[PDB]
Amino acid sequence: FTGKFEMESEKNYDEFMKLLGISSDVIEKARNFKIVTEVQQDGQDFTWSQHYSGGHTMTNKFTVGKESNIQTMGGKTFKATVQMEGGKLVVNFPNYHQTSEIVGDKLVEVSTIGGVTYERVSKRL
Ligand SMILES: Cc1cc2nc(N)[nH]c2cc1C
């Protein structure tokens, strides 16, 4: 997991952001943002950073098996416990399933709400 990763592919961005309830204008404007993910793993402990276009950054620190509060780009927050399941980090909350995985030097991040699955693939730098 440790590294720096640049977003290159994503599935179902529009559907997912609509389901979150953000405006089409913000969906359209935000579409062009570059996203760089920085991860440092130290045993069970993770430091997880997302760097957006125009200087903004969001860092989340968590331990596998321990409870924590994860935050988003916009500033929304939610309680969770990150689990290691078969090389994936897995998170759960009310009507929200999220996974992160390294697949051949690529960070693949899947998020599902209802029947809408969002995927992000990011290339290692
Ligand atoms: C803030 C934000 C901007 C994005 N732009 C694209 N393409 N995907 C995104 C995801 C998030 C969370």
Swiss-Prot record:
Tagged with keyword Membrane: yes
Keyword Disulfide bond among UniProt keywords: no
Keyword terms, alphabetized: Acetylation, Cytoplasm, Lipid transport, Lipid-binding, Membrane, Transport
Q: Which GO terms describe its cellular component?
A: cytoplasm; cytosol; membrane; nucleus
SUPFAM superfamilies tied to this protein: Lipocalins
Question: What are the GO MF terms of this UniProt record?
Answer: fatty acid binding; lipid binding
Report the InterPro entries cross-referenced here: Calycin, Fatty_acid-bd, ILBP
Tissue distribution of the protein: Isoform 1 is expressed in the jejunum, ileum, cecum and ascending colon intestine. Isoform 2 is xpressed in the gallbladder, duodenum, jejunum, ileum, cecum, ascending, transverse and descending colon, sigmoid colon and rectum. Isoform 2 is expressed in colorectal adenocarcinomas and their adjacent normal mucosa (at protein level).
From its record, what is one biological process in GO terms?
fatty acid transport
Expression is induced as follows: Isoform 1 is up-regulated by chenodeoxycholic acid (CDCA) via the FXR transcription pathway. Isoform 2 is up-regulated by NF-kappa-B and in all stages of colorectal adenocarcinoma. Isoform 1 is not up-regulated in all stages of colorectal adenocarcinoma.
Pfam (any one): Lipocalin_7
- Which purpose does this protein serve, as stated in its record? Binds to bile acids and is involved in enterohepatic bile acid metabolism. Required for efficient apical to basolateral transport of conjugated bile acids in ileal enterocytes. In vitro binds to bile acids in the order: deoxycholic acid > cholic acid > chenodeoxycholic acid and respective BA conjugation modifies affinities in the order taurine-conjugated > glycine-conjugated > unconjugated bile acids. Stimulates gastric acid and pepsinogen secretion.
What UniProt notes about the protein's domains is: Forms a beta-barrel structure that accommodates the hydrophobic ligand in its interior. Can bind at least two ligands per molecule, however, the stoichiometry is debated.
State the family named in the UniProt similarity comment for this chain: Belongs to the calycin superfamily. Fatty-acid binding protein (FABP) family.
Q: What's the protein name? A: Gastrotropin
Originating species: Homo sapiens
User: Its encoding gene is what?
Assistant: FABP6
